Amino acid sequence: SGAIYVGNYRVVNRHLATHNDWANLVWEDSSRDLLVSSTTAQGCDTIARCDCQTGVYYCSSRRKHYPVSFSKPSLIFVEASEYYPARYQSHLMLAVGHSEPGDCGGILRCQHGVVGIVSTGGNGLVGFADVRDLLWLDE
Ligand SMILES: COc1cccc(NC(=O)N2CCC[C@H](C(N)=O)C2)c1Cl
Ligand SMILES: [Zn+2]
């Protein structure tokens, strides 16, 4: 679990969005596993606007932060799950690191701010949904 709180927006994994997220929907994209909902309170986070390919993520299944080198946002095949059919997920960045299904929502940050959130995992892999291209989150 986990979310990004920026301005009057809450960014979550689409597959983990609550009834309240959907009732206050701003934007969602199944191909990116992202959903953004509106909030009444002002958020605690700031978004990176950069091309960093290294950063640190929070891994809830280890209660620890790990440094990672990750690929540029791209279209990657993701196997079927209870949440989605087998498909290509866009704007996804992969890295070598530990992840378990409940780790989704963990934040990846670089020196400039929030880069994205954990969205996939594999045998020694972790995938992050990028949010750096969503410029409207800042206004
Ligand atoms: C060790 O295996 C791991 C580790 C961490 C996460 C995952 N689950 C995914 O990757 N899924 C399921 C949820 C939905 C995701 C999606 N974005 O489609 C895909 C797995 Cl299989
Ligand atoms: Zn950066």
JSON list of C-alpha atoms and ligand atoms in Angstrom, two decimals:
[
{"chain": "A", "resi": 1, "resn": "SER", "atom": "CA", "xyz": [0.00, 0.00, 0.00]},
{"chain": "A", "resi": 2, "resn": "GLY", "atom": "CA", "xyz": [0.92, 3.69, -0.35]},
{"chain": "A", "resi": 3, "resn": "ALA", "atom": "CA", "xyz": [0.10, 6.98, -2.03]},
{"chain": "A", "resi": 4, "resn": "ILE", "atom": "CA", "xyz": [1.62, 10.30, -3.22]},
{"chain": "A", "resi": 5, "resn": "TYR", "atom": "CA", "xyz": [-0.05, 13.43, -1.78]},
{"chain": "A", "resi": 6, "resn": "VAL", "atom": "CA", "xyz": [0.71, 16.52, -3.95]},
{"chain": "A", "resi": 7, "resn": "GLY", "atom": "CA", "xyz": [-1.37, 19.71, -3.84]},
{"chain": "A", "resi": 8, "resn": "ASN", "atom": "CA", "xyz": [-5.03, 18.65, -3.83]},
{"chain": "A", "resi": 9, "resn": "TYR", "atom": "CA", "xyz": [-4.32, 15.26, -5.42]},
{"chain": "A", "resi": 10, "resn": "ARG", "atom": "CA", "xyz": [-3.78, 11.70, -4.13]},
{"chain": "A", "resi": 11, "resn": "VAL", "atom": "CA", "xyz": [-1.92, 9.33, -6.53]},
{"chain": "A", "resi": 12, "resn": "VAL", "atom": "CA", "xyz": [-2.42, 5.59, -5.94]},
{"chain": "A", "resi": 13, "resn": "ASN", "atom": "CA", "xyz": [-2.04, 2.27, -7.80]},
{"chain": "A", "resi": 14, "resn": "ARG", "atom": "CA", "xyz": [-5.27, 1.94, -9.81]},
{"chain": "A", "resi": 15, "resn": "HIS", "atom": "CA", "xyz": [-5.69, -1.70, -8.66]},
{"chain": "A", "resi": 16, "resn": "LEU", "atom": "CA", "xyz": [-5.61, -0.58, -4.99]},
{"chain": "A", "resi": 17, "resn": "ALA", "atom": "CA", "xyz": [-7.93, 2.49, -5.33]},
{"chain": "A", "resi": 18, "resn": "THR", "atom": "CA", "xyz": [-10.72, 2.68, -2.73]},
{"chain": "A", "resi": 19, "resn": "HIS", "atom": "CA", "xyz": [-14.45, 3.48, -3.13]},
{"chain": "A", "resi": 20, "resn": "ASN", "atom": "CA", "xyz": [-13.58, 7.04, -1.98]},
{"chain": "A", "resi": 21, "resn": "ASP", "atom": "CA", "xyz": [-10.82, 7.39, -4.63]},
{"chain": "A", "resi": 22, "resn": "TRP", "atom": "CA", "xyz": [-13.33, 6.45, -7.38]},
{"chain": "A", "resi": 23, "resn": "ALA", "atom": "CA", "xyz": [-15.99, 8.82, -5.93]},
{"chain": "A", "resi": 24, "resn": "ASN", "atom": "CA", "xyz": [-13.45, 11.71, -6.10]},
{"chain": "A", "resi": 25, "resn": "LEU", "atom": "CA", "xyz": [-11.83, 10.62, -9.43]},
{"chain": "A", "resi": 26, "resn": "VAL", "atom": "CA", "xyz": [-9.68, 13.13, -11.37]},
{"chain": "A", "resi": 27, "resn": "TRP", "atom": "CA", "xyz": [-7.92, 10.75, -13.83]},
{"chain": "A", "resi": 28, "resn": "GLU", "atom": "CA", "xyz": [-7.17, 7.03, -14.22]},
{"chain": "A", "resi": 29, "resn": "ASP", "atom": "CA", "xyz": [-5.24, 4.91, -16.72]},
{"chain": "A", "resi": 30, "resn": "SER", "atom": "CA", "xyz": [-5.47, 1.10, -16.59]},
{"chain": "A", "resi": 31, "resn": "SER", "atom": "CA", "xyz": [-2.48, 0.80, -19.01]},
{"chain": "A", "resi": 32, "resn": "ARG", "atom": "CA", "xyz": [-0.28, 2.64, -16.42]},
{"chain": "A", "resi": 33, "resn": "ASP", "atom": "CA", "xyz": [-1.84, 1.17, -13.21]},
{"chain": "A", "resi": 34, "resn": "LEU", "atom": "CA", "xyz": [-2.45, 4.75, -11.95]},
{"chain": "A", "resi": 35, "resn": "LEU", "atom": "CA", "xyz": [-5.40, 6.59, -10.44]},
{"chain": "A", "resi": 36, "resn": "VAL", "atom": "CA", "xyz": [-5.53, 10.18, -9.12]},
{"chain": "A", "resi": 37, "resn": "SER", "atom": "CA", "xyz": [-8.27, 11.41, -6.82]},
{"chain": "A", "resi": 38, "resn": "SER", "atom": "CA", "xyz": [-9.00, 14.85, -5.29]},
{"chain": "A", "resi": 39, "resn": "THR", "atom": "CA", "xyz": [-8.32, 15.71, -1.61]},
{"chain": "A", "resi": 40, "resn": "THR", "atom": "CA", "xyz": [-9.59, 18.48, 0.72]},
{"chain": "A", "resi": 41, "resn": "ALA", "atom": "CA", "xyz": [-6.23, 18.81, 2.58]},
{"chain": "A", "resi": 42, "resn": "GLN", "atom": "CA", "xyz": [-2.97, 20.10, 1.03]},
{"chain": "A", "resi": 43, "resn": "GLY", "atom": "CA", "xyz": [-0.46, 17.28, 0.33]},
{"chain": "A", "resi": 44, "resn": "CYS", "atom": "CA", "xyz": [3.03, 16.62, 1.86]},
{"chain": "A", "resi": 45, "resn": "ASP", "atom": "CA", "xyz": [4.92, 15.56, -1.34]},
{"chain": "A", "resi": 46, "resn": "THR", "atom": "CA", "xyz": [6.72, 17.26, -4.34]},
{"chain": "A", "resi": 47, "resn": "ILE", "atom": "CA", "xyz": [7.26, 15.59, -7.85]},
{"chain": "A", "resi": 48, "resn": "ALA", "atom": "CA", "xyz": [10.64, 15.23, -9.57]},
{"chain": "A", "resi": 49, "resn": "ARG", "atom": "CA", "xyz": [10.88, 16.83, -13.05]},
{"chain": "A", "resi": 50, "resn": "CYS", "atom": "CA", "xyz": [14.10, 15.19, -14.26]},
{"chain": "A", "resi": 51, "resn": "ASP", "atom": "CA", "xyz": [15.68, 12.27, -16.15]},
{"chain": "A", "resi": 52, "resn": "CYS", "atom": "CA", "xyz": [17.29, 10.51, -13.12]},
{"chain": "A", "resi": 53, "resn": "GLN", "atom": "CA", "xyz": [17.68, 6.70, -13.55]},
{"chain": "A", "resi": 54, "resn": "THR", "atom": "CA", "xyz": [18.91, 6.07, -9.94]},
{"chain": "A", "resi": 55, "resn": "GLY", "atom": "CA", "xyz": [17.03, 6.66, -6.69]},
{"chain": "A", "resi": 56, "resn": "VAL", "atom": "CA", "xyz": [15.81, 5.05, -3.48]},
{"chain": "A", "resi": 57, "resn": "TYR", "atom": "CA", "xyz": [12.52, 3.19, -2.89]},
{"chain": "A", "resi": 58, "resn": "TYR", "atom": "CA", "xyz": [10.64, 2.10, 0.20]},
{"chain": "A", "resi": 59, "resn": "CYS", "atom": "CA", "xyz": [10.06, -1.69, 0.47]},
{"chain": "A", "resi": 60, "resn": "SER", "atom": "CA", "xyz": [7.26, -2.42, 3.03]},
{"chain": "A", "resi": 61, "resn": "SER", "atom": "CA", "xyz": [7.99, -6.21, 3.02]},
{"chain": "A", "resi": 62, "resn": "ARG", "atom": "CA", "xyz": [11.46, -5.44, 4.45]},
{"chain": "A", "resi": 63, "resn": "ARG", "atom": "CA", "xyz": [10.59, -2.18, 6.40]},
{"chain": "A", "resi": 64, "resn": "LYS", "atom": "CA", "xyz": [13.62, -0.68, 4.58]},
{"chain": "A", "resi": 65, "resn": "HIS", "atom": "CA", "xyz": [14.70, 1.71, 1.82]},
{"chain": "A", "resi": 66, "resn": "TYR", "atom": "CA", "xyz": [16.91, 0.38, -1.00]},
{"chain": "A", "resi": 67, "resn": "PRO", "atom": "CA", "xyz": [18.96, 2.20, -3.66]},
{"chain": "A", "resi": 68, "resn": "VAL", "atom": "CA", "xyz": [18.14, 1.19, -7.31]},
{"chain": "A", "resi": 69, "resn": "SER", "atom": "CA", "xyz": [19.22, 1.77, -10.92]},
{"chain": "A", "resi": 70, "resn": "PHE", "atom": "CA", "xyz": [16.04, 1.69, -13.09]},
{"chain": "A", "resi": 71, "resn": "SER", "atom": "CA", "xyz": [15.20, 1.62, -16.77]},
{"chain": "A", "resi": 72, "resn": "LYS", "atom": "CA", "xyz": [13.59, 4.57, -18.61]},
{"chain": "A", "resi": 73, "resn": "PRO", "atom": "CA", "xyz": [9.74, 4.59, -18.70]},
{"chain": "A", "resi": 74, "resn": "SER", "atom": "CA", "xyz": [8.65, 2.03, -21.29]},
{"chain": "A", "resi": 75, "resn": "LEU", "atom": "CA", "xyz": [5.96, -0.42, -22.51]},
{"chain": "A", "resi": 76, "resn": "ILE", "atom": "CA", "xyz": [6.57, -3.76, -20.69]},
{"chain": "A", "resi": 77, "resn": "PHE", "atom": "CA", "xyz": [4.59, -7.01, -20.84]},
{"chain": "A", "resi": 78, "resn": "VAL", "atom": "CA", "xyz": [2.96, -7.83, -17.47]},
{"chain": "A", "resi": 79, "resn": "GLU", "atom": "CA", "xyz": [1.49, -11.34, -16.87]},
{"chain": "A", "resi": 80, "resn": "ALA", "atom": "CA", "xyz": [-2.23, -11.74, -15.96]},
{"chain": "A", "resi": 81, "resn": "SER", "atom": "CA", "xyz": [-3.16, -11.20, -12.31]},
{"chain": "A", "resi": 82, "resn": "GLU", "atom": "CA", "xyz": [-6.47, -11.06, -10.38]},
{"chain": "A", "resi": 83, "resn": "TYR", "atom": "CA", "xyz": [-6.52, -7.32, -11.20]},
{"chain": "A", "resi": 84, "resn": "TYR", "atom": "CA", "xyz": [-5.69, -7.27, -14.93]},
{"chain": "A", "resi": 85, "resn": "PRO", "atom": "CA", "xyz": [-5.60, -9.44, -18.01]},
{"chain": "A", "resi": 86, "resn": "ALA", "atom": "CA", "xyz": [-2.16, -10.14, -19.55]},
{"chain": "A", "resi": 87, "resn": "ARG", "atom": "CA", "xyz": [-1.19, -6.79, -21.21]},
{"chain": "A", "resi": 88, "resn": "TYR", "atom": "CA", "xyz": [1.53, -4.18, -21.89]},
{"chain": "A", "resi": 89, "resn": "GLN", "atom": "CA", "xyz": [1.82, -1.70, -19.03]},
{"chain": "A", "resi": 90, "resn": "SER", "atom": "CA", "xyz": [3.12, 1.69, -20.22]},
{"chain": "A", "resi": 91, "resn": "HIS", "atom": "CA", "xyz": [5.40, 4.23, -18.44]},
{"chain": "A", "resi": 92, "resn": "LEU", "atom": "CA", "xyz": [6.90, 1.37, -16.37]},
{"chain": "A", "resi": 93, "resn": "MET", "atom": "CA", "xyz": [10.53, 1.36, -15.10]},
{"chain": "A", "resi": 94, "resn": "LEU", "atom": "CA", "xyz": [12.25, -1.86, -13.96]},
{"chain": "A", "resi": 95, "resn": "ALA", "atom": "CA", "xyz": [15.04, -2.38, -11.47]},
{"chain": "A", "resi": 96, "resn": "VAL", "atom": "CA", "xyz": [16.71, -5.23, -9.62]},
{"chain": "A", "resi": 97, "resn": "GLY", "atom": "CA", "xyz": [15.37, -5.29, -6.07]},
{"chain": "A", "resi": 98, "resn": "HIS", "atom": "CA", "xyz": [13.00, -7.04, -3.68]},
{"chain": "A", "resi": 99, "resn": "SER", "atom": "CA", "xyz": [9.24, -6.67, -4.05]},
{"chain": "A", "resi": 100, "resn": "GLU", "atom": "CA", "xyz": [6.15, -8.65, -2.96]},
{"chain": "A", "resi": 101, "resn": "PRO", "atom": "CA", "xyz": [2.56, -7.83, -4.11]},
{"chain": "A", "resi": 102, "resn": "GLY", "atom": "CA", "xyz": [1.74, -5.72, -0.96]},
{"chain": "A", "resi": 103, "resn": "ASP", "atom": "CA", "xyz": [4.80, -3.54, -1.69]},
{"chain": "A", "resi": 104, "resn": "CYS", "atom": "CA", "xyz": [2.77, -1.68, -4.38]},
{"chain": "A", "resi": 105, "resn": "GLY", "atom": "CA", "xyz": [2.44, 1.98, -3.48]},
{"chain": "A", "resi": 106, "resn": "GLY", "atom": "CA", "xyz": [5.96, 2.34, -2.04]},
{"chain": "A", "resi": 107, "resn": "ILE", "atom": "CA", "xyz": [7.53, 5.61, -3.21]},
{"chain": "A", "resi": 108, "resn": "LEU", "atom": "CA", "xyz": [10.67, 5.83, -5.44]},
{"chain": "A", "resi": 109, "resn": "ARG", "atom": "CA", "xyz": [12.47, 9.21, -4.92]},
{"chain": "A", "resi": 110, "resn": "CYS", "atom": "CA", "xyz": [15.60, 10.81, -6.38]},
{"chain": "A", "resi": 111, "resn": "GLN", "atom": "CA", "xyz": [17.34, 14.05, -5.20]},
{"chain": "A", "resi": 112, "resn": "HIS", "atom": "CA", "xyz": [14.62, 16.09, -7.05]},
{"chain": "A", "resi": 113, "resn": "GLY", "atom": "CA", "xyz": [11.51, 14.56, -5.52]},
{"chain": "A", "resi": 114, "resn": "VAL", "atom": "CA", "xyz": [9.06, 11.73, -6.10]},
{"chain": "A", "resi": 115, "resn": "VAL", "atom": "CA", "xyz": [9.69, 9.74, -9.29]},
{"chain": "A", "resi": 116, "resn": "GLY", "atom": "CA", "xyz": [6.96, 7.07, -9.04]},
{"chain": "A", "resi": 117, "resn": "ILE", "atom": "CA", "xyz": [5.39, 4.23, -7.07]},
{"chain": "A", "resi": 118, "resn": "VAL", "atom": "CA", "xyz": [5.95, 0.44, -6.93]},
{"chain": "A", "resi": 119, "resn": "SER", "atom": "CA", "xyz": [3.50, -1.25, -9.37]},
{"chain": "A", "resi": 120, "resn": "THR", "atom": "CA", "xyz": [5.02, -4.64, -10.32]},
{"chain": "A", "resi": 121, "resn": "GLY", "atom": "CA", "xyz": [7.47, -7.20, -9.04]},
{"chain": "A", "resi": 122, "resn": "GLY", "atom": "CA", "xyz": [9.19, -10.40, -10.00]},
{"chain": "A", "resi": 123, "resn": "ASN", "atom": "CA", "xyz": [11.98, -12.83, -9.10]},
{"chain": "A", "resi": 124, "resn": "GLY", "atom": "CA", "xyz": [14.49, -10.23, -7.92]},
{"chain": "A", "resi": 125, "resn": "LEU", "atom": "CA", "xyz": [12.72, -7.46, -9.89]},
{"chain": "A", "resi": 126, "resn": "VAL", "atom": "CA", "xyz": [10.72, -4.36, -8.89]},
{"chain": "A", "resi": 127, "resn": "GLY", "atom": "CA", "xyz": [8.67, -2.21, -11.30]},
{"chain": "A", "resi": 128, "resn": "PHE", "atom": "CA", "xyz": [7.71, 1.44, -10.77]},
{"chain": "A", "resi": 129, "resn": "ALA", "atom": "CA", "xyz": [4.93, 3.43, -12.42]},
{"chain": "A", "resi": 130, "resn": "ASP", "atom": "CA", "xyz": [6.50, 6.79, -13.47]},
{"chain": "A", "resi": 131, "resn": "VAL", "atom": "CA", "xyz": [4.68, 10.03, -12.57]},
{"chain": "A", "resi": 132, "resn": "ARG", "atom": "CA", "xyz": [7.27, 12.62, -13.78]},
{"chain": "A", "resi": 133, "resn": "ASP", "atom": "CA", "xyz": [5.47, 13.30, -17.04]},
{"chain": "A", "resi": 134, "resn": "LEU", "atom": "CA", "xyz": [2.16, 14.25, -15.29]},
{"chain": "A", "resi": 135, "resn": "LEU", "atom": "CA", "xyz": [2.84, 17.99, -15.22]},
{"chain": "A", "resi": 136, "resn": "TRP", "atom": "CA", "xyz": [-0.69, 18.89, -14.16]},
{"chain": "A", "resi": 137, "resn": "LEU", "atom": "CA", "xyz": [-0.05, 17.34, -10.68]},
{"chain": "A", "resi": 138, "resn": "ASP", "atom": "CA", "xyz": [1.94, 20.60, -9.86]},
{"chain": "A", "resi": 139, "resn": "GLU", "atom": "CA", "xyz": [-0.96, 22.99, -10.51]},
{"chain": "B", "resi": 1, "resn": "LIG", "atom": "C1", "xyz": [7.44, -11.76, -6.84]},
{"chain": "B", "resi": 1, "resn": "LIG", "atom": "O1", "xyz": [6.29, -11.41, -7.60]},
{"chain": "B", "resi": 1, "resn": "LIG", "atom": "C2", "xyz": [5.74, -10.18, -7.40]},
{"chain": "B", "resi": 1, "resn": "LIG", "atom": "C3", "xyz": [6.30, -9.19, -6.62]},
{"chain": "B", "resi": 1, "resn": "LIG", "atom": "C4", "xyz": [5.65, -7.97, -6.49]},
{"chain": "B", "resi": 1, "resn": "LIG", "atom": "C5", "xyz": [4.45, -7.74, -7.14]},
{"chain": "B", "resi": 1, "resn": "LIG", "atom": "C6", "xyz": [3.88, -8.73, -7.94]},
{"chain": "B", "resi": 1, "resn": "LIG", "atom": "N1", "xyz": [2.66, -8.51, -8.63]},
{"chain": "B", "resi": 1, "resn": "LIG", "atom": "C7", "xyz": [2.56, -7.87, -9.81]},
{"chain": "B", "resi": 1, "resn": "LIG", "atom": "O2", "xyz": [3.53, -7.55, -10.47]},
{"chain": "B", "resi": 1, "resn": "LIG", "atom": "N2", "xyz": [1.29, -7.68, -10.27]},
{"chain": "B", "resi": 1, "resn": "LIG", "atom": "C8", "xyz": [0.09, -7.94, -9.48]},
{"chain": "B", "resi": 1, "resn": "LIG", "atom": "C9", "xyz": [-0.64, -6.67, -9.10]},
{"chain": "B", "resi": 1, "resn": "LIG", "atom": "C10", "xyz": [-0.87, -5.79, -10.32]},
{"chain": "B", "resi": 1, "resn": "LIG", "atom": "C11", "xyz": [0.45, -5.50, -11.03]},
{"chain": "B", "resi": 1, "resn": "LIG", "atom": "C12", "xyz": [0.23, -4.67, -12.29]},
{"chain": "B", "resi": 1, "resn": "LIG", "atom": "N3", "xyz": [0.76, -3.46, -12.28]},
{"chain": "B", "resi": 1, "resn": "LIG", "atom": "O3", "xyz": [-0.38, -5.12, -13.25]},
{"chain": "B", "resi": 1, "resn": "LIG", "atom": "C13", "xyz": [1.05, -6.84, -11.45]},
{"chain": "B", "resi": 1, "resn": "LIG", "atom": "C14", "xyz": [4.53, -9.95, -8.05]},
{"chain": "B", "resi": 1, "resn": "LIG", "atom": "CL1", "xyz": [3.84, -11.21, -9.01]},
{"chain": "B", "resi": 2, "resn": "ZN", "atom": "ZN", "xyz": [15.89, 13.38, -10.29]}
]
